[PDB]
């Protein structure tokens, strides 16, 4: 059978600065000032995707280190999730390109789809978010912890 690779499993810290076409992204895809505060200035993002070996399943954990906003959580490929955050909820369904992660993300109170890509090759990670016809780009680079 087919070697697979998913070199977005690990742990990733965002590199320094604002993504590529943040800006413009904001603008578009109406971005509130209280979420574009987390990606502004000094503020890090910590991001991991792992899987357990029994499991079925695979985890993700958000963290912003200094701030209260945190997300965890587990999803199966394919089969939709929702999240909820100040009372507003996200659909989510996750699936694979290849080594590529891919999370389509409906938004229903805004009427608001989000497709976001990861894509990683050894120690660095691209995320690539499209909304409302506007594409972002985030670089992340692996550490241990
Ligand atoms: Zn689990
Ligand atoms: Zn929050």
Same mark, same amino acid.
């Given at each position: 059978?087919?070697?697979? *690779?998913?070199?977005?499993?690990?742990?990733?810290? /965002?590199?320094? #600065? +604002?993504?590529?076409?943040? !800006?413009?992204?904001? %603008?578009?895809?109406?971005?509130?000032?209280?979420?574009?505060?987390?990606?502004?200035?000094?503020?890090?993002?910590?991001?991991?995707?792992?899987?357990?070996? *029994?499991?079925?399943?695979?985890?993700?954990?958000? /963290?912003?280190? #200094? +701030?209260?906003?945190?997300? !965890?959580?587990?999803? %199966?490929?394919?089969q939709e999730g929702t999240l909820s955050h100040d009372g507003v909820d996200l659909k989510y369904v996750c699936t694979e390109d290849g080594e590529q992660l891919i999370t389509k993300i409906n938004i229903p109170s805004k009427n608001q789809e989000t497709i976001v890509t990861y894509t990683a090759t050894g120690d660095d990670l691209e995320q690539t978010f499209t909304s409302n016809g506007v594409t972002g780009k985030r670089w992340y680079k692996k550490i241990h912890a």
């Open positions: 059978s087919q070697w697979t *690779g998913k070199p977005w499993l690990g742990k990733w810290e /965002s590199i320094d #600065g +604002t993504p590529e076409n943040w !800006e413009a992204f904001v %603008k578009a895809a109406n971005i509130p000032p209280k979420d574009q505060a987390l990606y502004n200035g000094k503020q890090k993002t910590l991001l991991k995707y792992w899987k357990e070996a *029994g499991e079925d399943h695979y985890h993700v954990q958000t /963290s912003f280190p #200094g +701030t209260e906003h945190k997300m !965890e959580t587990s999803f %199966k490929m394919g």
